[PDB]
Design a protein around this ligand. Sequence first.
Ligand SMILES: O=C(O)[C@@](O)(COP(=O)(O)O)[C@H](O)[C@H](O)COP(=O)(O)O
Ligand SMILES: O=C(O)[C@@](O)(COP(=O)(O)O)[C@H](O)[C@H](O)COP(=O)(O)O
Ligand SMILES: O=C(O)[C@@](O)(COP(=O)(O)O)[C@H](O)[C@H](O)COP(=O)(O)O
Ligand SMILES: [Mg+2]
Ligand SMILES: [Mg+2]
Ligand SMILES: [Mg+2]
Lengths: 99, 105, 99, 105, 452, 448, 452, 91
Amino acid sequence: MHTETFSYLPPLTDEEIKKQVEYILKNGWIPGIEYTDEPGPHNSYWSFWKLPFFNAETAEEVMEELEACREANPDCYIKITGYDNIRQGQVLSFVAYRP
Amino acid sequence: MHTETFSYLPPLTDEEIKKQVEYILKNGWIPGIEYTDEPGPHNSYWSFWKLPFFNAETAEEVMEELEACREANPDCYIKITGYDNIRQGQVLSFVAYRPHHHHHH
Amino acid sequence: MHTETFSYLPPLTDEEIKKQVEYILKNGWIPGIEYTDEPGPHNSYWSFWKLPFFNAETAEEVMEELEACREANPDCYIKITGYDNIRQGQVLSFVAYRP
Amino acid sequence: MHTETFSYLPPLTDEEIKKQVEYILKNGWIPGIEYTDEPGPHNSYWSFWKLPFFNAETAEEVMEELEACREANPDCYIKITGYDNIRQGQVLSFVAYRPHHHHHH
Amino acid sequence: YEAGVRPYRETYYDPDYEPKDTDLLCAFRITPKPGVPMEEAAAAVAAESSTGTWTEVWSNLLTDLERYKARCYRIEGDVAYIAYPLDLFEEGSIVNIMSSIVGNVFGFKAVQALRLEDMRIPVAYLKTFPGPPTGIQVERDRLNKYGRPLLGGTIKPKLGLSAKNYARVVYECLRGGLDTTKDDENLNSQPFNRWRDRFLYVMEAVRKAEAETGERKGHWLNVTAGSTEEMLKRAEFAAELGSRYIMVDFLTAGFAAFASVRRRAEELGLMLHCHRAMHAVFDRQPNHGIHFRVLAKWLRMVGGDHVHTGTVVGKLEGDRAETLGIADLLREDYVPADPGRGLFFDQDWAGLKPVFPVASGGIHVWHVPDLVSIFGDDAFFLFGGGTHGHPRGSRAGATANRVAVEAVVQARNEGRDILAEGREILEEAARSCPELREAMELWGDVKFEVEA
Amino acid sequence: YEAGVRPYRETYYDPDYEPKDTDLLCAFRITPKPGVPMEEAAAAVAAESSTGTWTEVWSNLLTDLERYKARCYRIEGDVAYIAYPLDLFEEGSIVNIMSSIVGNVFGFKAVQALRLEDMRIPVAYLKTFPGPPTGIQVERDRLNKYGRPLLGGTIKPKLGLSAKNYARVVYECLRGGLDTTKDDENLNSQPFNRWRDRFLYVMEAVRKAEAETGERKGHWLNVTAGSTEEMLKRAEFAAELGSRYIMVDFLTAGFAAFASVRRRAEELGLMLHCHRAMHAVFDRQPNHGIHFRVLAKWLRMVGGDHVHTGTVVGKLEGDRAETLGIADLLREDYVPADPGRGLFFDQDWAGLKPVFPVASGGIHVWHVPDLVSIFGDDAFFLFGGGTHGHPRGSRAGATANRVAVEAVVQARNEGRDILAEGREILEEAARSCPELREAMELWGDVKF
Amino acid sequence: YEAGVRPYRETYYDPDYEPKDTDLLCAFRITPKPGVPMEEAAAAVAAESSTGTWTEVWSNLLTDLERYKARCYRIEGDVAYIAYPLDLFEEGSIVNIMSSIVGNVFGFKAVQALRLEDMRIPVAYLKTFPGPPTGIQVERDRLNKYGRPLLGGTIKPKLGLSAKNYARVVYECLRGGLDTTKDDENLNSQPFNRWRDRFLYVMEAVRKAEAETGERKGHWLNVTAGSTEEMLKRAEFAAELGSRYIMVDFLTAGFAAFASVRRRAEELGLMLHCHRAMHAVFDRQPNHGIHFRVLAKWLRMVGGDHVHTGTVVGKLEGDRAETLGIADLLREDYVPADPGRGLFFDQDWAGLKPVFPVASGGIHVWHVPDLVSIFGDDAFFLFGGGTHGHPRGSRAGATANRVAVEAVVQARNEGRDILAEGREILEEAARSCPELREAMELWGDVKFEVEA
Amino acid sequence: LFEEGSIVNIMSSIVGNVFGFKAVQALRLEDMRIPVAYLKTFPGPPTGIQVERDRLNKYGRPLLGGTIKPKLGLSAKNYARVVYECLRGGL
Ligand SMILES: O=C(O)[C@@](O)(COP(=O)(O)O)[C@H](O)[C@H](O)COP(=O)(O)O
Ligand SMILES: O=C(O)[C@@](O)(COP(=O)(O)O)[C@H](O)[C@H](O)COP(=O)(O)O
Ligand SMILES: O=C(O)[C@@](O)(COP(=O)(O)O)[C@H](O)[C@H](O)COP(=O)(O)O
Ligand SMILES: [Mg+2]
Ligand SMILES: [Mg+2]
Ligand SMILES: [Mg+2]
């Protein structure tokens, strides 16, 4: 099963993940974390890990929430999201952790 | 040209017309007079000879209007109407005068 | 048969007609003359007598055309018209002569 | 798996269940017991544990049936129903027993 | 719960019950099986037409039978009065009324004969029905005919006439003075006369007779057919041809299809003549069945513009007192009770339009004084055989009947006693109408027994 | 995010906001609850008619509220001006306008009374609407009538007449000189008079009066009904009979069904008279409701060919200055602001067709000088009681009302002062018209 | 006839008149123009809402004004009672009621202010209306939800949310414990959120939340649009997607289009939530307008399945006594008069289904005890801001409100005084529900003034 | 001057006859300012980028596609084979 953006590249390291979060923050977008145990074309609403981090200031803050979500849901797929309220849409979404 | 109620009986005399007007008034219904030179199935609205006679008390008052209408429109069919405002429906309508040409075909 | 505006008043004298023409000109509207021998509810396009008098400056000019149309069509109804190109519609129309 | 009324409160004790049964009876409504292993939005008809208790007079009689049903179907969700035949509508329905696996996910 | 069989009267006989203004009330004449007490017979009718059956069921306790059960609240002589709650009935559905009130209860072993005499339709339920689309007063306005009974007649032979011949008879009748003519109830669409052919030719006759006489005419084109879709198709063609009328056999077609046709009739601007074919199957015998006055109430609720009511004096049975009650039920805004006419309840019509009574069957000129006396002005008198059986044919026959009606009306309006002077009024009019004299001589010895 | 209740003022009051030409602007007359400042009351109205609610919500951060929020940008006295971004509204839907602008904000505890006085409809939003299906110019061209107010009149009694008697009154009125007649607003289809019967009989009367007089005639057949489907059915039948007109109670039927009928009227070639029944429920009191000029704007946007505007001098209440402003709003291509008539905004009408004002209610011949002075030629003057109430009935009454109008028009065009000489003009015309003299004598002492 | 102007009171003021059971009765609070006697003001309202005008007309004599005229039959204080005959009104048409009763009479010079307080709909006219298609009891059956108020909430921000974001909020609300969610009254179809996009994504959220929680869910999809045809199209798509509900702004769309949508809703098996947007334009002021209780009767007659009724304690105005009367008018089979609640007449509903009251606007957890006490079980409580404004978002907010309702219900059933112990019951429940504690702390100081 | 919602009308005026006049031997329409007031008479895309990405559940990269080749000449079943191979391979 493929999981959309970056799914055809080798699985990302934490450092590569953090660079994507930095890309999200540098552009003024909102980073988020979603997770599910039922990935697939049928599922368009993954579970939110907390809310979109509107108040996130650094990538390290986001990576700490990612690890917490990883620890709390080791059997789930976990993706990083980036959100722009101007176009009102997600500008980036990729799986950071696969069970 | 038949003209509905009583037109299959002999033409009414003034005495016969007056009895029908008395029937209208005895029952508290409103007598009226209408006239036209275009009688027929497509004409629902003949010409009013005055408004309906809401204040008529005797049949002779109505017959006087009939004579007036008859003398003013000798070329027209003239009918007596009787209106019941309770049912809001005509309760008797009949022709009282036909022009000369009607009877000489 | 009635002929719309002013047909429930006594037939107009030439002097009453000219006052209506003056009203048309005073307001900057264009006077015109139309005629027909088939007036009635079915006829929306009476015959133009010449074109609308875009160049008329005086009411006497219009009365001359009216009298000329009168003489050339004694069997016809003749109407005076006033026209406004801003609203793009006639602002007055009345019969000035009946056969 | 939530089970509608009271399922967002802590699981009810037998004392709390009995008070709800007393509420049903005090108001002259008919208590009932139903059970199923297939709870969910597509199941409108759980299994009757006997007919509704039209002749029940005390809450303890109902609690005894609840214990009986609970002991016979430990793998099933069990709910108390309250029926008002005047409005012909259920007036209170809540789950009184959930199987062990419910609480150990 | 307590299973087992209980007498019906324990639950469904309640002589303390006070009928509500929203209750539908029935008067049943009951003949119990010998040995069955009247109270049990009546309770069985109440039970098995509302909520009950033959043994107690646990599911009774899932509802409020005190709200829904019918109850026999009074037994007087052989008449049981039964009240039915409003909520038992489907709004606007005569079919549903029949399914409860006369569905099964006429076939029970415990009740050997049962006759529904009357039914009180409560206003709360009545007004879920529309009533006639036209009504007497609007119909007279559409026809421009005032101050007299209206004239009609069935084309004869009943069956066997081609469409063209059918239209010829119509033409002669209408141009001779009849206001209307009609298809026989059993003329629909048949090998000898297909309905499209008849509709087309007849309306040519209607238009020609109207133009020639100067009086507005109609023909009651029968749309009765085997399916609702076919009846609606024939009504559409009647309207396309400009007919003022259509006709429907509302009992043989049935009430569900009747309601469909009455809806389409109003949408199309048609007036709806209703023939009561089959009614005597239900209403002839006084010990078992449904009296016509009940069928007449249902007829007015759905909304027929006319319905046949009987003649009293003609070839078909009809008691004078019962017919007078039926006419009131059809034409008046409120009808008090009068068991002497078989009206066991009052009936309020809360503004529903009145229906034209239609008197038809075996009548001729000599009957006109009695018919005017029974019905007054607001009725159709139909002369089929009484028109085409004239020695000179249908035109002369139509004239004879029209003159007879007008003569009697004229005399009445003048103050004469049309019952004591009926024959003298006709003889006076015959002096100026040879067609009337010929009709009077032909049928002077033709009479039928009469019942008050 | 920062949860909690904030004053509406912090987000929805921006006194430095410059309205855009695309913004929809509202003038709200605010009566705040005692102790609530005007800035907070105005912000509450702006918030709860656009994007906000009573407490801050996390989902606000999913969108750009700077783009979508309404803003109170100016307060003058007790009038708050609020600007609404164009994107907030559904194209071509008055129903949506009302759902936002008058949806809930009139019932807030914080605002004790509230009145919508005016609305600046941007040209960009007006172009989503079709406007009148006919319009004044096309309507005069269809009627072939130019140079005078048009005559009309409601049939009376309002209710109680049969279809056949009803059309008798119509026939007498039209053959007597009225251009039109109309169903009363409350005459729809009823047991004493069903609409099919009325439509048929009325059109016999119309055609008959047209042939006898030689002038084109019409009757405003009321299609107002309980459902949209029934309204469309009745319009279809009016068109089948060749009627030039139908009529709709656009407020009691409602704007959604009004839009349905307006579309079908244009498809059927019908002109659409609009009655404002119910307007006075909420457009009369100066402290609360919706001003009629706003209703008139919505009316012109949906598309009515006429709407009642009041008489000023008749039995129903009306303000002369406001009426003159409303008349311009209905007829002109552009209407500048004018505080002396309650016109708070310049209104560009973006090429939408104009609407006939209709003056009706308790008027008779003596009012004609005033009415001509107020409205000019582009209006209908309706005489119901002022026609049937004539001593000799409806035909005579119609002739009197037609003569009065034509006489006053003639006098005006000749340069006479029709207010100063109104009595003399009428008396002169009455010397040649006995019908008019009798009307003048009957109602000479009837003022409102 | 006698032409000329007569005072209205000569024909239309009749204090001897006895209202008929079929009469429609109105209670008008009247403020005459100074110098106009109350009797003349009241007669003017009666005349100009039934048959009269400002001068006598000859055509009056062509009908029976004794049958058709409205009559002021009683004046008490500043309230005029006016009776309207049944035949004046078109069956089944609220539009026609409005056109007579409130058409012109509020704008007369002789009457400076006028407020319709109440209206007695007679059974004969009431039953020409169908009422709600579903009703409280059937709706609870369809939802399988018994013994508690039902939970809902408006999605916020009112406008500006994309369809996908809109559906995310719905998902979080429903999976957190709300039974329903709803479009804002002013969200229809707009550039930022087109209706087909919203309907599709929302129903994906509804289905997912239902599967995950195991409880049946709904979303009140707003079909309100600029034309009736568009509203019917959006209702059809809602039904194709399997939605249990649609929503309509019945006053802004208007009653003619409302009736169209209510017919289509039942045909499609949809429940119809009705939003009363614009009502305060008509009903806020006590001197002029129409009180909401009249609008509520009309709402139930057409047949909304719910309607908003006010909260009393929330951000929008609503008196407790008047709200209790409105709830009775919506839910009960018969409602006696009580002018203390503004009910000047009794009202019989003759079997029409009951409407769910919906309490919405500025409410949060602390209000739940009062809301349960005011409305009992048969109501929706809606928390929009009170859900999404939770410090942890919509799911946590939904849970907090659901727990609050259930806790109060549980305590009531046990015999506790939820008014005297309201706050203590919530504090007890918060010990087991952190989401509830957070909601209680956030809004503990947020209150609105209340009126009895 | 323009019919609401009709690009056809725009072209009928702006590029209808003026490109073929003897007096103007060549003509190029370089740009056009569509006023907001005329734009509002048009509905625009039926889906749009944002809603399309939400329907696809694809965010953060260009989307991949490809025309099936040969342009013409492929049967239906062969056509669908190429489609299958492309899509299962990552397009
Ligand atoms: O078929 C027939 O007998 C008739 O055509 C009468 O023909 P005649 O005029 O030649 O007798 C009528 O249908 C009956 O009168 C119906 O009976 P009722 O009116 O009692 O239902
Ligand atoms: O019902 C009526 O009163 C009228 O028929 C007037 O009758 P009269 O001509 O007999 O007075 C009109 O509807 C009102 O003028 C409407 O008021 P507005 O024009 O202010 O909406
Ligand atoms: O638009 C609003 O304000 C609401 O969505 C409430 O949102 P919150 O839940 O965020 O307050 C409701 O429509 C109002 O309650 C309607 O008022 P009523 O119920 O009085 O008609
Ligand atoms: Mg027969
Ligand atoms: Mg009116
Ligand atoms: Mg809302």
